[PDB]
């Protein structure tokens, strides 16, 4: 940490709901969804998850949805995949 | 606006039933009531008119016209101007502080749209398409070009209209290619299952109108229903055995409105029925389809004998391929029809030519015939070239 | 103890149809003892109308009632066992409208707004809801969601079975 | 003659439909006298 080895030293924080419902709303992007769908809500749900753990609840949502018949996306199934990746991120 | 245009076109089909004139106007009477309809149920009341079309309060009143419910009062327009002008007003302001706060991107396009969907509702071919386009000029989204979708398709098809929209459908979609992601290919390949059902789709859209389903519909500019059974008939009509026996047999789609609307009873249901290789059960069901699905529909009705015939040769082709020797009058005496007018008709495939049907007036008798290596393949080959040999000539045509 | 037997000796009358109307105090009569005895006896009893074979009527008319009479007492609480038999009529009804919407419901309830063993019960008749829309990979999807959510809880062998 | 239509074939010709169906009927109907 002494400079010159590392000059400028920063932290990155939070993150929580709002990084993920982003993170989320970023990766919830990419796969194509079902309108009414509200990703703060669904980072609401999220508690003690990460930016990659968020791809989780798409992946889950989208394994939700593409197990719905769906490459759209409800609102639901990433509420649902929130806490299936809270799972996860309280799971071992 | 899709009831409208329906509606619309229902009783400006009026023909059958004072009811296909009624029950459309019905609701449109009142809908005019519901929407400031008049700029265009004013030329909607010009649409149908010079037929029945012809009794209203403003444009024509006449006693030839069974529709007096083509009629007006100026209050409608009173009030539509009052409504209009209340919600340019409304809108007026507001978009103007809309542009006065710099207010929105999209939300200054979105009054924009709230002014442009009146039109919709008025029956304005007009500001909501500059509105739409300040709105698209106002657009940061391509969701904001899928309103101009939504626009566009609420622009034509309010008139069930044509190219530019479709031009536009294509103008808008081709922007970018994502579609609404997964949807708005829907809408393009719907309203574009639309525009090429214009008077088309026939082979074209028609599985893409099959296709995607039900991962939109519209409201204003269309129902499911409407796609289901408008993408059923053509591409049933128009695709394979196979393609309709492996989809139109059944799909949970069709499950779930197989009868629903009885708005079908029919299409591959008689289709089936008739790929059930029926003679005389389907000779009915065609115009038991037909004044029940063709007439009933826009482009059903404005294609009309495309349809007729072919599935009426088309069994043949079955009937053939069952025998390469049938009797014309097993065929058309043993099925209990006229033969002659039938095969008269039938007699009309022989210069449509898409019989390999062999047939004797006389022995009322009927054969085949087969590709085997003329086919088309070792057949058409000489246009092919030629074409070619044209645009070669055409090529040595420049020269300079 | 009667009213089970002598319900269906109600039944064997059509005082089932007495008590039908019973079954709402009935409700508030076990209610008068407890909720937990009542929603394991009220749905029983209509249970036993359902056996002694009855038209859907009674039941649906009853068994709507105690879905309702659910609601009106405090009771959100499997109603929609209730109504997954009520859905199960709308199945017998053949009504997969009544049962899907119903069981959509019964699917949001049971969602966990409501229990997930039962969740995988409805889904079960959903399936056959599905199976007799003849929707199948639906059917599938209920049945697999009932199958595979099955493995995450115990079913009746009869579900099992099923 | 408006502007697109489905084009060629060329219109062909019309009054079938029906004119079937009156022998749908008909044919059907002499059916049914037979």
Excluded at chain 2, 16 to 43: G, T
Excluded at chain 2, 331 to 344: E, I, K, P, T, Y
Aim: charged residues 30%; contains cysteine; glycine residues 4%.
């Amino acid at each position: 940490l002494r400079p010159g080895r590392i000059d400028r030293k920063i932290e990155f924080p939070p993150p929580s709901v709002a990084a993920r419902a982003e993170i989320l709303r970023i990766h919830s992007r990419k796969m194509n969804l079902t309108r009414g769908i509200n990703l703060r809500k669904v980072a609401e749900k999220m508690n003690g998850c990460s930016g990659a753990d968020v791809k989780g609840v798409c992946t889950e949502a989208g394994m939700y949805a593409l197990r719905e018949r769906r490459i759209h996306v409800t609102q639901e199934d990433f509420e649902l995949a929130v806490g299936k990746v809270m799972n996860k991120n309280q799971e071992t | 606006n899709y009831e409208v245009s329906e509606k619309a076109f229902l009783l400006t089909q009026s023909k059958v039933s004072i009811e296909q004139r009624k029950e459309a106007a019905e609701f449109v009477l009142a809908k005019i009531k519901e929407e400031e309809m008049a700029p265009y149920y004013k030329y909607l009341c010009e649409e149908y008119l010079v037929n029945n079309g012809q009794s209203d309060l403003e444009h024509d009143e006449k006693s030839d016209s069974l529709n007096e419910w083509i009629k007006f009062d100026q209050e409608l327009y009173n009030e539509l101007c009052k409504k209009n002008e209340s919600k340019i007003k409304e809108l007026n302001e507001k978009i103007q502080k809309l542009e006065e706060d710099d207010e929105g991107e999209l939300e200054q396009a979105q009054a924009w749209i709230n002014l442009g969907e009146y039109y919709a509702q008025i029956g304005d071919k007009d500001n909501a398409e500059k509105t739409l386009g300040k709105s698209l000029s106002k657009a940061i989204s391509t969701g904001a070009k899928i309103d101009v979708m939504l626009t566009i398709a609420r622009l034509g098809f309010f008139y069930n209209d044509q190219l530019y929209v479709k031009e536009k459908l294509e103008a808008v979609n081709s922007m970018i290619e994502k579609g609404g992601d997964w949807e708005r290919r829907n809408r393009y390949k719907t309203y574009y299952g639309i525009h090429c059902l214009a008077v088309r789709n026939f082979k074209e859209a028609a599985k893409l109108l099959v296709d995607s389903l039900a991962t939109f519909t519209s409201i204003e500019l269309t129902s499911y229903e409407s796609i289901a059974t408008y993408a059923s008939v053509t591409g049933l009509f128009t695709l394979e055995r196979t393609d309709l026996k492996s989809k139109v047999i059944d799909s949970p789609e069709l499950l779930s409105l197989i009868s629903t609307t009885a708005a079908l009873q029919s299409i591959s249901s008689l289709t089936i029925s008739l790929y059930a290789s029926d003679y005389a059960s389907y000779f009915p069901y065609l115009l038991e389809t037909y004044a029940n699905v063709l007439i009933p529909c826009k482009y059903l009705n404005r294609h009309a004998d495309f349809f007729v015939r072919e599935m009426r040769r088309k069994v043949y082709a079955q009937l053939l391929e069952s025998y390469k020797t049938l009797s014309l009058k097993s065929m058309a005496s043993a099925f209990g029809v006229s033969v002659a007018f039938l095969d008269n008709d039938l007699g009309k495939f022989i210069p449509n030519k898409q019989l390999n049907c062999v047939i004797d007036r006389v022995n009322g008798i009927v054969e085949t015939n087969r590709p085997d290596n003329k086919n088309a393949q070792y057949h058409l080959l000489v246009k092919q070239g030629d074409g070619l040999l044209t645009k070669l000539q055409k090529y040595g045509a420049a020269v300079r | 103890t009667s009213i089970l037997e002598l319900g269906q000796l109600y039944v064997t009358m059509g005082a089932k149809d007495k008590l039908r109307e019973f079954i709402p105090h009935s409700t508030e009569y076990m209610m008068q003892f407890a909720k937990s005895k009542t929603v394991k006896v009220l749905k029983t009893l209509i249970e036993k109308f359902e056996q002694v074979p009855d038209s859907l009527d009674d039941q649906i008319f009853v068994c709507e009632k105690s879905i309702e009479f659910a609601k009106r007492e405090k009771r959100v609480f499997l109603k929609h066992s209730l109504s997954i038999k009520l859905a199960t009529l709308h199945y017998q009804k053949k009504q997969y409208k009544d049962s899907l919407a119903l069981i959509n419901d019964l699917l949001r309830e049971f969602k966990k707004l409501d229990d997930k063993p039962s969740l995988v019960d409805v889904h079960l008749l959903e399936s056959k809801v599905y199976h007799k829309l003849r929707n199948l990979a639906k059917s599938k999807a209920s049945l697999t969601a009932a199958r595979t959510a099955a493995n995450s809880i115990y079913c009746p062998t009869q579900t099992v079975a099923e | 003659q408006t502007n697109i239509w489905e084009e060629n074939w060329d219109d062909v010709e019309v009054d079938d439909d029906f004119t079937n169906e009156l022998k749908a009927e008909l044919d059907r109907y002499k059916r049914e006298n037979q």
